[PDB]
């Protein structure tokens, strides 16, 4: 589990310029969780994503992640084993490849935390499948590759560190509709099977309403709402005010509410809607 | 009044070649007058400039000690006979201070692309010698705009690298350089791939040759003040 | 109006790598909005590249509004073609918005007297006039693209090619760029060609061209493509919501209309169906 | 087309260098009185990824910066003594992007591998950079025309920061370049 307890972070703290990107953030995520963090750009949803990895320590408040606890006085040297427990996929992760073969780049994660090359390349072998690719790719150069498959290798190299929490800033950005899809499912499958905590920063409400069990609405550095997607999406004006919106299943749901149909919950995805219309259809 | 275009460079080019000449004291009393005379107009705070100068003086001293230290020591444990260091170190420190002041006065009253278009128009001559000065202007104008973009993308690669498990700064000198590959390789490749995507874009735009540049692109009285105060100085 | 006939571009070997193209032919009318969807490695990438001088094909010929693309007829085809690329930086020249918008002209021999007011005009056409004094870094992907467009409006051509110009853009940012092309289309009768995986961009087109493994493989009005249902994602386009809904209904026993419905049409159908 | 592409790549290696100056973490890596640069290993690249034409340009762009740096914003404290005469600062940078370029061309013509040529052309361009500074320092040690012990001291504190820079580029320098000319070669 992840727990923020009054976490606030100010850049250049103790300085006149100082900027407070993240203020008074308390949130809990259970084990096997799926948090989506949404909100306007530069509302500190990413200042807050870097907290988890331990790329920034809180300025005040505490964070607890399983065995781990980060406080402002935590020294970054007793935090190194957190960089593997929490695996962080950065946006456009393709610009992080650098090794000669793609197998050495994947195995690169693991080795940095101890693994001898023998079993790290062995791990790198098995990691390639997981992500999508064929064994041919193992020996190839990272740059021989397609933009889309460079990202698979990027991602897979992170999965190789065997993390218990998986943080992706923008997994599907700049990808074709199918690519976006192979991957959203890859991630759901890992969470669904093999039990993993996903943290997802998106601007795509559909991914959220369809995959998340927990949403955080970040606005201007504060935690405006937190709770289930049902909670968070059920009021729309409020969302607009924080420059967001409900997903499309819900707007269309309104159209049908406008026409005299009543739903027992506000439908957030097409499946859940179709689930209502079906039962209603039987009643017809 | 930083609203001075080009000359400001040629100024500080020429302000530099003045500081060495000044051997007298009745002479370069004239210097501080126009030196602080320049600073006073730009701002009255007088604090940031001194503060924003401190980091550098640790260096200038670090040098000036070397000048003085060697002569007395003689690289021989000769102690302090060090007169030359006292006058020669003193001159250095004095010199490499009036410059910094005025170069720092320049950088604080001049947006960096205003220099680049200045620098690359103080070579508005410089053609008629086979130098494609205008093309170099281009690559300069470009180099400039990518400096922030490359800097973002650099820390971005770095943090991403850290997540993987790379220790930047830790150790030395080998383990410290060895950690620089996983940032260097991508930084360059991104810049290569960056420039391939960029050149292509330029071709789509109607540019095929550097030779035709258009668009973009009071001051004398300062040079009057740097003439009726300069030539009126190498007297002493 | 422009004409592609019997076009082929391989790397000279096989079908893979930079997406091949084999025997591609179509023509655009004037003031049409043609969208070109396709998966990956359908040459839809390189097909964009090819309608400008930037791709050296061996077989086939391109002709744009009269002139046909040849090494010494390139600059006279490019003149009437405004292209906007996938990445918002990397097509940004100069530190400042207004130097970029001008870059089109300044290195096309126009004089600062005619150039100054055509640029403030161009910038204002895309609603970007306040950002004139700005570094590209301080701009979002959204904006950086709007000034790329201001760059093409400043030179004002007849063809606007949008090579997945919304690909890397936030949805709010993407929505603006699209609306200011629609906004553009109404005035000046601009001709738009779009390569995208975006349903919204593809639905705003008059006619859609589907590429599959390097070969032009279908062509229709957008309502016809969308009846591909879930096969759309695989095809190279996301799903219109109504097709999401129809899919999720088949899964739950309900057989809906085949022809593509709109929200308005589908909402109405459900009410009529559900008494 | 190719020429235009080259114009931009230079301009971007030109930005990487501005970037290494602006950000000290990238420019160098302390010793601690001394410090080995990394701005060196970027020109070894520009020389042997594009050719000597660019190794000239990027190597010149450097030596020109360490020039204005020496006055306005010193690099080292040992910079206001040496790199204030633009022969001594400029010449090594300019002429080591040259050895960089050709010694890859030359050694490829000798039918070496792309690895072996890179390595060689780096440990050389380092050398044929450090030597010039010792060269040009030894020269201006002994004449005025406008401190021999001081000059000797200056010479001493180059025969070390650069001695590492030589072991730097030969392994490390090669890796961020073999990939590079590879992409360039296909184009």
Swiss-Prot record, chain A:
A GO cellular component entry from the record: ATP-binding cassette (ABC) transporter complex
Binding locations of ATP: 39-46
InterPro entries found in the cross-reference section: AAA+_ATPase, ABC_transporter-like_ATP-bd, ABC_transporter-like_CS, ABC_transpr_CbiO/EcfA_su, ECF_ABC_transporter_ATP-bd, EcfA2, P-loop_NTPase
Keyword list, A-Z: ATP-binding, Cell membrane, Membrane, Nucleotide-binding, Translocase, Transport
MF GO annotations: ATP binding; ATP hydrolysis activity; ATPase-coupled transmembrane transporter activity
SMART domains named in the record: AAA (SM00382)
Subcellular location, principal: membrane
Pfam families, A to Z: ABC_tran
Membrane topology of this protein: Peripheral membrane protein
SUPFAM superfamilies: P-loop containing nucleoside triphosphate hydrolases
Compartments where located: Cell membrane
Keyword Protease (UniProt): no
Span of domain ABC transporter: 2-245
Function: ATP-binding (A) component of a common energy-coupling factor (ECF) ABC-transporter complex. Unlike classic ABC transporters this ECF transporter provides the energy necessary to transport a number of different substrates.
Name of the protein described by the UniProt record: Energy-coupling factor transporter ATP-binding protein EcfA2
Source species of the chain: Levilactobacillus brevis (strain ATCC 367 / BCRC 12310 / CIP 105137 / JCM 1170 / LMG 11437 / NCIMB 947 / NCTC 947) (Lactobacillus brevis)
Swiss-Prot record, chain B:
Compartments where found: Cell membrane
One MF term in the entry's GO annotations: transmembrane transporter activity
InterPro entries (alphabetical): ABC/ECF_trnsptr_transmembrane (IPR003339), ECF_transporter_component (IPR051611), EcfT (IPR024919)
Transmembrane residue ranges: 16-36, 55-75, 86-106, 131-151, 219-236
Main location (coarse class): membrane
Keywords assigned: Cell membrane, Membrane, Transmembrane, Transmembrane helix, Transport
Domain of life of the native organism: Bacteria
Membrane topology: Multi-pass membrane protein
One Gene Ontology cellular component annotation held by this UniProt entry: plasma membrane
Signal peptide (UniProt feature, chain positions): none
Family to which this protein belongs: Belongs to the energy-coupling factor EcfT family.
Task of the protein: Transmembrane (T) component of an energy-coupling factor (ECF) ABC-transporter complex. Unlike classic ABC transporters this ECF transporter provides the energy necessary to transport a number of different substrates.
Oligomer status and interactors: Forms a stable energy-coupling factor (ECF) transporter complex composed of 2 membrane-embedded substrate-binding proteins (S component), 2 ATP-binding proteins (A component) and 2 transmembrane proteins (T component). May be able to interact with more than 1 S component at a time.
Protein name from the UniProt record: Energy-coupling factor transporter transmembrane protein EcfT
Lineage: Bacteria, Bacillati, Bacillota, Bacilli, Lactobacillales
Gene: ecfT
From Swiss-Prot, chain C:
Naturally occurring in which organism (per UniProt): Levilactobacillus brevis (strain ATCC 367 / BCRC 12310 / CIP 105137 / JCM 1170 / LMG 11437 / NCIMB 947 / NCTC 947) (Lactobacillus brevis)
NCBIfam families: ECF_ATPase_1 (TIGR04520), PRK13635.1 (NF010156), PRK13648.1 (NF010167)
The family this protein is said to belong to: Belongs to the ABC transporter superfamily. Energy-coupling factor EcfA family.
Transmembrane segments: none
UniProt-listed SMART domains: AAA
Pfam family, one: ABC_tran
Chief location category: membrane
SUPFAM superfamilies on file: P-loop containing nucleoside triphosphate hydrolases (SSF52540)
This protein's UniProt keywords: ATP-binding, Cell membrane, Membrane, Nucleotide-binding, Translocase, Transport
Highest taxon of source: Bacteria
Residue ranges of every copy of the ABC transporter domain listed in the record: 4-238
EC number: 7.-.-.-
InterPro entries xrefs: AAA+_ATPase (IPR003593), ABC_transporter-like_ATP-bd (IPR003439), ABC_transporter-like_CS (IPR017871), ABC_transpr_CbiO/EcfA_su (IPR015856), ECF_ABC_transporter_ATP-bd (IPR050095), EcfA_1 (IPR030947), P-loop_NTPase (IPR027417)
Assembly, per entry: Forms a stable energy-coupling factor (ECF) transporter complex composed of 2 membrane-embedded substrate-binding proteins (S component), 2 ATP-binding proteins (A component) and 2 transmembrane proteins (T component).
Xref: Gene3D superfamilies: P-loop containing nucleotide triphosphate hydrolases
GO molecular function: ATP binding; ATP hydrolysis activity; ATPase-coupled transmembrane transporter activity
Record localization: Cell membrane
Bilayer disposition of the protein: Peripheral membrane protein
Residues holding ATP: 38-45
Purpose of the protein: ATP-binding (A) component of a common energy-coupling factor (ECF) ABC-transporter complex. Unlike classic ABC transporters this ECF transporter provides the energy necessary to transport a number of different substrates.
Listed GO CC annotations: ATP-binding cassette (ABC) transporter complex
EC class: translocase
Protein name per its UniProtKB record: Energy-coupling factor transporter ATP-binding protein EcfA1
Residue runs in coiled coils: none
